[PDB]
Write a protein that binds this ligand. Structure first.
Ligand SMILES: NC(=O)C1=CN([C@@H]2O[C@H](COP(=O)(O)OP(=O)(O)OC[C@H]3O[C@@H](n4cnc5c(N)ncnc54)[C@H](O)[C@@H]3O)[C@@H](O)[C@H]2O)C=CC1
Ligand SMILES: Cc1cc2nc3c(=O)[nH]c(=O)nc-3n(C[C@H](O)[C@H](O)[C@H](O)COP(=O)(O)O)c2cc1C
Ligand code: SF4
Ligand code: FES
Lengths: 213, 430, 63
């Protein structure tokens, strides 16, 4: 976790990077989403778009984003170092994040953690030798009623036990895509002992509309 | 009325909360969404502001500011700059996941609330700042926004009323401090998510220096229902200054962790016993309850028996309502470890701009780690209390108060537990 | 290599409340004097909102 940059042959300002023309059109749409005179707001999505080009950010996407938006590169460095979702180091293809905050710690997320560590033979913040997985530990991800839960890439795998996360890892190694959902009987947020509320069918339009409207 | 709770299914605003019905435009249109919106748009901003300040609806973000007044300072004639409504869809607070289900399952309710709110203040467009990790929810909201744009509900000649309104979705990049409204405003503009100083309030100088109102998803999605059903219908629930319905996320050491809407002044014991299925090991196995996530202080089993979950009965109970996110810890939990994890979360999510939080949250993390290990003295404990008293009220944003409150609550409620831990360490290793 | 001197008035600093008292003490003892006017700094017009302007150049690049 170093917030300073040292020039390396892997990560140098002369590293080849350029956006695809479809990404140029997407960047133009992102810029057109913002008011004129305030193009610098487009630093936030477009740089993330650069991550979707590579999966990580060398220091050539930051200079390119600074060049195409007329902002100094130090502002792009500030944006890339403030937020934790921008990868400034080359991570693996399947980036696994395990939430270990208190509403997830009470439902034994550390069990998921040691199961993943035992299966993959790596530790927290360590990349697999074949560059297929990278396991880290993050803060809360906003699905605390589905605790414990993990996030792989942009997908949520929630309400897991060690057996389910082992099955998820074996499915990821095979090349298939698992369903991003809870592994228990429930679907999104309902109680496991049946629907306590919202059992009535919806009323529909025209119900409860006051007069004079 | 004095007995609250047991909300009937007819009066629940958030239908299709669990996603069993269609979340797209046709499914939402058969439930009550987008119905007679043009009548409200023609009646206009004064009528909308009166109808939302008659209901007594407060801010569901966690501060409880009245929504009518907060949307009423922005109503003023233009000075050449456009007006903006921004929807806070971050929920970096632990325990809170209600707006995730609101966005994922009822996006058209959010879009109609954005339209009604932007009509209330004369906003030019709407900016939705969804969380960075919520990619699927953002894509669902964008699909619903395109479906509403295709039908002519928003955009050019919105809903056949002659008003111009737009909606934009801006993804985050994984920051809890960006949930703060001024830090959210700064992070929209492409800067670091560091909060501003009030004054100037966002109603005067907000995003891009324009007038801006930042409102939560939960208090925006209920605005068309308030303006349609009536202010008195929303005010018929709960106590005075405690009107409406609230979404509760009950989780932790419970049998069935779930998100459920309820009357605003429901008792805590009834809610836990009914919706969550009971505490793991029975009600007598309770140790502590955090009522509104990591910002609000914890309360023990002695207070949880006869407490009401609204604003007033919880500020009187030396805590806060917060986001109404219930975290339950039973007797098989280390409370000091949980509070140390909360302080570690607060030090890993801290923008580091202003000095007292930037130093004192790390100081509290180190002291709490020593407390968990037990390598401390009782005379330090009150000193830790004073550290919290040097953070609360001396910071730019309310993350300092939200970090000082759990330490104060844990100390004030379980000083004997900490003292026993450190004296056991002293008598064992020394 | 020490700093040798031959000036008896090398370390003589006198303190006065006002300019007129200093000038009277100066002309009382028969010393030629140079008087420098007091340079009070000019007050500014600070504004925290000016860092977040809409159509002006006083927008802060970062904070
Ligand atoms: N929902 C969530 O995810 C989280 C919620 N919270 C809760 O949020 C609260 C802290 O948030 P804050 O915004 O700092 O609370 P509060 O001090 O600021 O103010 C609430 C709103 O009222 C407005 N306001 C207040 N006085 C005003 C005035 N005179 N003129 C115009 N506008 C005025 C503010 O601009 C703000 O939008 C706490 O109750 C905390 O528990 C904390 C962390 C996360
Ligand atoms: C550190 C911090 C984080 C916050 N995060 C959120 C959030 O994620 N969602 C939210 O609605 N309010 C959040 N708030 C509260 C906001 O300051 C503000 O109350 C909200 O944007 C609008 O509140 P309202 O419902 O009264 O309009 C946060 C406050 C602080 C101090
Ligand atoms: S209290 Fe902490 S997070 Fe908030 S402005 Fe100060 S340094 Fe930033
Ligand atoms: S505590 Fe883990 S998702 Fe919120």
């Amino acid at each position: 976790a170093l917030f300073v940059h040292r020039d390396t042959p892997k990560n140098n300002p002369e590293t080849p990077f350029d956006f695809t023309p479809e990404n140029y059109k997407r960047i133009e749409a992102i810029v057109k989403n913002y008011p004129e005179g305030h193009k610098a707001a487009a630093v936030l999505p477009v740089l993330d778009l650069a991550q979707r080009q590579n999966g990580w950010l060398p220091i050539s996407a930051m200079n390119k984003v600074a060049e195409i938006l007329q902002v100094p590169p130090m502002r792009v460095y500030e944006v890339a170092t403030f937020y934790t979702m921008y990868n400034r180091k080359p991570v693996g293809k399947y980036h696994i994040q395990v939430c270990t905050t208190t509403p997830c710690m009470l439902r034994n997320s550390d069990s998921i953690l040691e199961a993943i560590q035992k299966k993959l033979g790596i530790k927290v913040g360590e990349t697999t030798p074949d560059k297929l997985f990278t396991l880290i530990e993050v803060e809360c991800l906003g699905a605390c009623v589905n605790a414990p839960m993990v996030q792989i890439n942009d997908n949520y795998y929630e309400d897991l036990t060690p057996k389910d996360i082992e099955e998820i890892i074996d499915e990821l190694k095979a090349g298939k895509i698992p369903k991003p959902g809870p592994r228990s009987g429930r679907f999104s947020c309902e109680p496991a002992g049946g629907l306590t509320s919202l059992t009535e069918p919806p009323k529909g339009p025209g119900f409860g509309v006051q007069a004079g409207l | 009325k004095t007995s609250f709770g047991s909300l009937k299914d007819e009066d629940r605003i958030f239908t299709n909360l669990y996603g069993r019905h269609d979340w797209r435009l046709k499914g939402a249109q058969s439930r009550g969404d987008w119905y007679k919106t043009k009548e409200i748009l023609l009646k206009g901003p004064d009528w909308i502001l009166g109808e939302v300040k008659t209901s007594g609806l407060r801010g569901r973000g966690g501060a409880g500011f009245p929504t009518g007044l907060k949307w009423s300072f922005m109503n003023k004639p233009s000075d050449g700059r456009p007006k903006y409504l921004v929807v806070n869809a971050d929920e970096g607070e632990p325990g809170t996941c209600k707006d995730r289900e609101i966005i994922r399952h009822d996006p058209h309710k959010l879009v109609e609330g954005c339209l009604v709110g932007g009509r209330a203040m004369g906003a030019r467009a709407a900016y939705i700042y969804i969380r960075g990790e919520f990619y699927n929810e953002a894509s669902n909201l964008q699909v619903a926004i395109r479906e509403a744009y295709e039908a002519g509900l928003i955009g050019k000649n919105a809903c056949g009323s002659g008003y111009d309104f737009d909606v934009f979705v801006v993804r985050g990049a994984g920051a809890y401090i960006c949930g703060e409204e001024t830090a959210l405003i700064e992070s929209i503009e492409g800067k670091q998510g560091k909060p501003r100083l009030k004054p100037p309030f966002p109603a005067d100088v907000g995003v891009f220096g324009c007038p801006t109102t930042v409102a939560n998803v939960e208090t925006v999605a209920v605005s068309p229902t308030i303006c349609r059903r009536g202010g008195a219908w929303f005010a018929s629930f709960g106590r005075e200054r405690n009107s409406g319905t609230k979404l509760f996320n009950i989780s932790g050491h419970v049998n069935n962790p779930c998100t459920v809407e309820e009357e605003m002044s429901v008792p805590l014991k009834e809610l836990i016993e009914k919706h969550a299925g009971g505490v793991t090991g029975g009600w007598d196995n309770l140790l502590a309850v955090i009522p509104g996530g990591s910002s609000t202080p914890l309360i023990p089993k002695s207070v949880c028996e006869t407490v009401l979950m609204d604003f007033d009965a919880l500020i009187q109970a030396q805590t806060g309502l917060g986001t109404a996110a219930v975290i339950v810890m039973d007797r098989s939990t280390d409370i000091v470890k949980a509070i140390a994890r909360l302080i570690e979360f607060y030090k890993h999510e801290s923008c580091g701009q202003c000095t007292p939080c930037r130093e004192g949250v790390d100081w509290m993390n180190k002291v709490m780690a020593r407390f968990v290990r037990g390598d401390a003295r009782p005379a330090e404990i009150d000193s830790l209390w004073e550290i919290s008293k040097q953070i609360e009220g001396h910071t730019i944003c309310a993350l300092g108060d939200g970090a000082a409150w759990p330490v104060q609550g844990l100390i004030r409620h379980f000083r004997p537990e900490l003292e026993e831990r450190m004296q056991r360490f002293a008598q064992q290793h020394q | 290599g020490w700093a040798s001197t031959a000036d008896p008035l090398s370390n003589l600093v006198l303190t006065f409340s006002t300019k007129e008292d200093a000038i009277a003490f100066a002309e009382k003892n028969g010393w030629s004097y140079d008087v420098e006017e007091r340079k009070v700094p000019k007050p500014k017009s600070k504004s925290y909102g000016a860092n977040f302007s809409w159509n002006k150049r006083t927008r802060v690049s970062t904070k």
